[PDB]
Amino acid sequence: RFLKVKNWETDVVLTDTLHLKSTLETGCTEHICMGSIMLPTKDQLFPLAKEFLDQYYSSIKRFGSKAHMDRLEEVNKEIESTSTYQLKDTELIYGAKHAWRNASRCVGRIQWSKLQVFDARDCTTAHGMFNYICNHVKYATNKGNLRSAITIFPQRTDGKHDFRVWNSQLIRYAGYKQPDGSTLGDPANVQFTEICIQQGWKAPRGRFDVLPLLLQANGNDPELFQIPPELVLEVPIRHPKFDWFKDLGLKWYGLPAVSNMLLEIGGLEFSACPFSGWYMGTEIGVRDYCDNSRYNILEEVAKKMDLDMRKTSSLWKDQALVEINIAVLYSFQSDKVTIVDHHSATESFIKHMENEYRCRGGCPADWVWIVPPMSGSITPVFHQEMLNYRLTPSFEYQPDPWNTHVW
Amino acid sequence: RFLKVKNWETDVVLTDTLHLKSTLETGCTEHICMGSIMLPVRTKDQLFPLAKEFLDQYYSSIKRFGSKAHMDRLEEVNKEIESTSTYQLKDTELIYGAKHAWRNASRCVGRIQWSKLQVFDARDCTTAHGMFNYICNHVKYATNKGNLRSAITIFPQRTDGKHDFRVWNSQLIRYAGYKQPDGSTLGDPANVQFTEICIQQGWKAPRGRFDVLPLLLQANGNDPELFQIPPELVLEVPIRHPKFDWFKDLGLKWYGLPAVSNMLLEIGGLEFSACPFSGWYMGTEIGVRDYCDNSRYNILEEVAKKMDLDMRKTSSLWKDQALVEINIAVLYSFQSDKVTIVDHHSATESFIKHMENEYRCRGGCPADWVWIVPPMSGSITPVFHQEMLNYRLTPSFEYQPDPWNTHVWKG
Ligand code: HEM
Ligand code: HEM
Ligand SMILES: CNCc1cccc(CCc2ccc3c(C)cc(N)nc3c2)c1
Ligand SMILES: CNCc1cccc(CCc2ccc3c(C)cc(N)nc3c2)c1
Ligand SMILES: C[C@H](O)[C@H](O)[C@H]1CNc2nc(N)[nH]c(=O)c2N1
Ligand SMILES: C[C@H](O)[C@H](O)[C@H]1CNc2nc(N)[nH]c(=O)c2N1
Ligand SMILES: [Zn+2]
Numbered sequence: 096r097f098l099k100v101k102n103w104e105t106d107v108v109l110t111d112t113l114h115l116k117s118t119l120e121t122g123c124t125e126h127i128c129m130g131s132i133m134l135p136t137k138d139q140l141f142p143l144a145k146e147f148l149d150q151y152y153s154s155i156k157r158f159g160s161k162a163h164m165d166r167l168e169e170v171n172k173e174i175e176s177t178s179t180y181q182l183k184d185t186e187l188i189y190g191a192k193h194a195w196r197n198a199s200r201c202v203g204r205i206q207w208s209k210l211q212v213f214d215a216r217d218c219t220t221a222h223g224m225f226n227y228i229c230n231h232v233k234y235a236t237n238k239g240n241l242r243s244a245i246t247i248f249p250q251r252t253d254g255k256h257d258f259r260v261w262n263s264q265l266i267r268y269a270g271y272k273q274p275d276g277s278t279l280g281d282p283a284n285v286q287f288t289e290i291c292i293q294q295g296w297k298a299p300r301g302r303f304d305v306l307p308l309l310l311q312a313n314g315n316d317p318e319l320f321q322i323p324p325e326l327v328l329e330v331p332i333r334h335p336k337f338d339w340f341k342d343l344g345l346k347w348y349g350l351p352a353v354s355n356m357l358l359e360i361g362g363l364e365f366s367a368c369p370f371s372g373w374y375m376g377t378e379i380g381v382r383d384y385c386d387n388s389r390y391n392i393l394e395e396v397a398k399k400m401d402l403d404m405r406k407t408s409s410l411w412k413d414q415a416l417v418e419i420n421i422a423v424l425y426s427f428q429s430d431k432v433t434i435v436d437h438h439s440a441t442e443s444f445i446k447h448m449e450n451e452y453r454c455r456g457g458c459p460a461d462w463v464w465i466v467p468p469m470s471g472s473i474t475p476v477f478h479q480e481m482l483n484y485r486l487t488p489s490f491e492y493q494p495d496p497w498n499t500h501v502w
Numbered sequence: 503r504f505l506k507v508k509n510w511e512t513d514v515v516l517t518d519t520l521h522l523k524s525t526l527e528t529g530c531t532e533h534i535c536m537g538s539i540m541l542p543v544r545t546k547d548q549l550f551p552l553a554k555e556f557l558d559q560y561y562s563s564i565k566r567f568g569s570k571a572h573m574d575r576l577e578e579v580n581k582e583i584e585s586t587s588t589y590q591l592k593d594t595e596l597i598y599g600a601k602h603a604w605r606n607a608s609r610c611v612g613r614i615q616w617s618k619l620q621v622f623d624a625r626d627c628t629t630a631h632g633m634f635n636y637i638c639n640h641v642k643y644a645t646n647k648g649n650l651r652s653a654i655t656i657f658p659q660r661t662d663g664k665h666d667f668r669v670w671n672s673q674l675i676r677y678a679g680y681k682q683p684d685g686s687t688l689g690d691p692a693n694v695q696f697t698e699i700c701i702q703q704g705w706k707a708p709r710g711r712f713d714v715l716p717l718l719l720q721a722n723g724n725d726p727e728l729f730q731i732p733p734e735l736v737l738e739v740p741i742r743h744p745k746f747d748w749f750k751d752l753g754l755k756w757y758g759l760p761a762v763s764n765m766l767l768e769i770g771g772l773e774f775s776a777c778p779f780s781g782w783y784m785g786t787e788i789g790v791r792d793y794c795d796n797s798r799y800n801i802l803e804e805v806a807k808k809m810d811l812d813m814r815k816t817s818s819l820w821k822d823q824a825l826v827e828i829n830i831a832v833l834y835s836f837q838s839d840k841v842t843i844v845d846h847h848s849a850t851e852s853f854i855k856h857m858e859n860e861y862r863c864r865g866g867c868p869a870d871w872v873w874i875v876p877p878m879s880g881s882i883t884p885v886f887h888q889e890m891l892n893y894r895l896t897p898s899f900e901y902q903p904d905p906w907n908t909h910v911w912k913g
Contacts, residue, residue: 408834
């Protein structure tokens with residue numbers, strides 16, 4: 096009941112007590128572990144509000160104070176009356192920082208307290224959302240000196256008035272299926288790239304075309320907006336040893352900004368809450384460039400290195416994978432765009448774990464997602480036992496809007 | 503109840519019913535997942551259900567469920583249990599049991615081979631010397647001049663827990679580790695504690711970097727004894743690199759036969775505490791873990807120096823570069839000497855085929871993603887985007903405490 100986690104490379108042992116404050120469910124049972132599965136009313140609301148306000152007032156060392164009780168009372172009144180309630184700016188900021196803090200799959204959480212929170216709950220239209228998003232992008236990008244941020248649009252009401260950003264990230268490349276069979280651009284975005292055209296987008300039908308924004312305000316029909324190009328920082332990819340690398344014509348954007356998740360605070364649901372940080376090198380080089388269902392450029396690179404691609408035993412895939420990732424990091428660093436390598440990020444996360452166990456009694460962590468997609472065992476998180484559990488406030492998944500939108 | 507797993511690279515979806523036959527616990531609850539935790543005397547009372555469940559399984563596989571052969575065996579086992587408090591397995595049952603423990607090993611990526619297991623029945627063994635003999639025959643048969651063959655040798659089952667057979671070594675073949683006074687380690691740091699025990703038990707340690715450890719064998723709950731595997735039985739492979747000639751000068755070599763000897767085999771409620779088993783290596787076991795783990799030979803830096811890599815910032819990925827070259831060398835060396843080895847791309851590919859086939863013919867394949875995914879180049883292997891369900895089936899291989907921690911010393 097007071098759980099222990101061991102690091103087998105350093106024998107260090109942490110004791111977890113934070114898990115007892117867990118609310119939501121994991122997917123697993125005593126008979127079956129689902130750790131590798133990607134996705135497993137007025138009465139509901141007040142306990143949720145209470146739990147949150149209780150942790151909020153605890154966090155500011157005013158647990159059981161006048162302010163505390165008064166606020167609990169005030170929210171209780173507003174719920175009974177309005178069948179929902181509003182967060183004070185302070186609670187909203189606390190909640191967003193804490194959703195990040197509780198993201199068990201996020202390796203970058205040592206940064207959690209430095210999140211810049213933009214309150215966009217006064218937004219009413221898609222044009223309004225566009226403006227807030229542009230502002231977020233420019234602030235976050237900061238001419239390459241990236242800063243973490245989240246922008247929070249109005250909360251769900253009766254689920255018929257939802258704000259949604261239809262893109263999965265604020266900034267992604269288009270994907271169009273070819274007559275010749277294969278795919279131009281980004282295969283992950285083929286269906287979305289089409290719904291854009293299907294709603295009016297004029298695709299340049301190129302390979303690295305920045306997708307337009309598709310913004311839904313108050314449950315209305317979504318609108319197309321193009322992010323000003325000067326706001327989209329991009330990095331051309333070159334290798335610091337191979338000059339032929341640049342002729343592959345590769346580039347990536349500097350700002351990773353996830354826009355399709357739902358932020359839950361004190362039982363309230365924020366269905367539009369785009370958030371951003373900065374990339375770990377492997378995210379672009381290993382998953383984005385080298386996944387089969389993506390840009391899949393391993394073969395091409397390996398050819399240009401003239402490796403023996405006859406037998407898998409030569410490890411040419413591994414050799415290329417490394418070079419590609421050396422290049423990504425090299426390109427960002429040379430162009431002064433923030434990026435972290437998987438060795439540094441994982442080392443930082445171990446330290447963050449140390450801190451969290453010490454000052455909070457634990458840190459929910461999902462090993463399947465924390466371990467990088469290359470060189471796993473040579474990073475310190477590989478031999479680190481982790482406990483995975485769900486705390487709130489949180490970021491959750493939510494259905495793609497098109498599967499739901501009552502037109 | 504039906505459960506689905508999706509492969510997110512190919513969109514292939516599979517459906518698991520096999521998890522319904524799951525007995526043991528996972529460690530997980532609805533409120534906590536312990537999927538990355540390494541590890542999360544039995545009476546007539548609980549023995550007959552366990553026996554019955556096994557014999558049911560067994561007679562189904564041979565398509566004789568409910569036959570007179572089936573019923574008579576249940577009655578036979580029952581009588582023997584209430585009469586003797588345990589029971590004996592037939593050879594057919596032993597063999598079936600051992601194949602299935604491998605087959606149910608959720609952490610094993612090489613399970614495609616599970617039906618080709620050579621089972622040696624060592625239940626007539628009574629002494630340590632007898633154990634040494636059986637183990638030598640195992641090593642020779644399994645090794646087969648480099649053309650490796652999967653095998654398991656099974657010593658007598660536990661009775662009262664006070665007369666256990668144990669192989670004290672974690673693997674039949676492993677290199678000594680010696681802690682030096684300056685805190686440095688000579689040889690394999692993973693085996694220091696065990697090495698010390700051997701020295702204490704009278705082993706004359708040559709104190710080199712690659713000394714093969716002696717066998718420490720316990721028969722029938724007696725004190726363990728030391729035996730030296732004949733060197734001619736120990737196949738080793740010097741490590742060289744196909745392009746780098748300085749690599750051989752690092753003086754590395756590894757043994758060819760991976761043979762795990764500290765696990766417990768459970769079949770129909772019976773516990774086999776000494777059951778050494780072997781297959782062949784996946785390259786990264788030696789190249790990534792055995793050489794490059796910080797708690798192991800840790801030659802990453804030395805290889806990187808000789809490659810003249812930019813070791814100033816980690817973002818040069820020098821570590822990643824040296825790791826690949828070291829694994830290239832391991833495979834190259836083994837193939838050149840015609841000693842069976844499999845690369846991680848080949849092994850994961852085969853596993854996905856195995857797994858898919860297991861879902862069709864069996865209704866599932868328990869699998870521990872945390873252990874199935876290779877320790878380098880994870881996402882460019884096909885298991886990485888493969889959702890997997892983990893649950894525990896018997897027969898099974900289980901962990902057990904180290905014997906030096908539990909043994910009652912005779913003298
Ligand atoms: C600042 C540097 C950051 C780094 C280096 C980072 C890194 C990562 C990485 C590597 C993953 C694994 C996902 C994958 O492999 O594609 C991840 C997931 C995640 N990150 Fe972070 N992140 C950062 C900032 C943030 C911020 C600011 C937030 C929210 C405020 C956040 C929330 C999340 C969430 C919720 C997930 C899991 C998403 C899911 O379950 O699909 N991250 N992050
Ligand atoms: C024939 C070639 C085989 C290959 C390539 C193979 C591969 C592997 C690998 C790579 C691991 C993970 C080890 C690690 O990285 O730490 C593993 C674990 C395991 N293997 Fe296999 N294996 C083979 C044969 C066998 C055989 C013959 C058995 C038993 C009869 C077996 C039973 C197991 C078990 C029980 C585990 C998990 C042990 C644990 O949970 O600590 N394997 N295997
Ligand atoms: C290969 N992934 C597959 C996949 C599948 C579903 C969702 C995701 C998003 C993970 C995610 C979410 C937010 C992030 C932020 C803020 C920064 C950052 N550097 N990385 C981030 C990654 C990814
Ligand atoms: C460096 N890892 C740490 C670690 C910790 C506990 C146990 C193990 C060995 C797993 C194991 C057991 C049996 C195996 C057989 C028969 C063949 C084979 N190729 N590999 C095998 C691996 C490893
Ligand atoms: C099926 C597989 O478990 C799933 O796609 C996960 C595996 N681990 C991952 N880990 C990270 N960091 N990112 C991912 O997208 C995934 N994918
Ligand atoms: C804590 C962590 O789960 C543990 O060290 C595991 C991780 N996955 C592994 N996977 C393999 N194949 N071998 C291992 O030894 C480990 N170690
Ligand atoms: Zn679990």
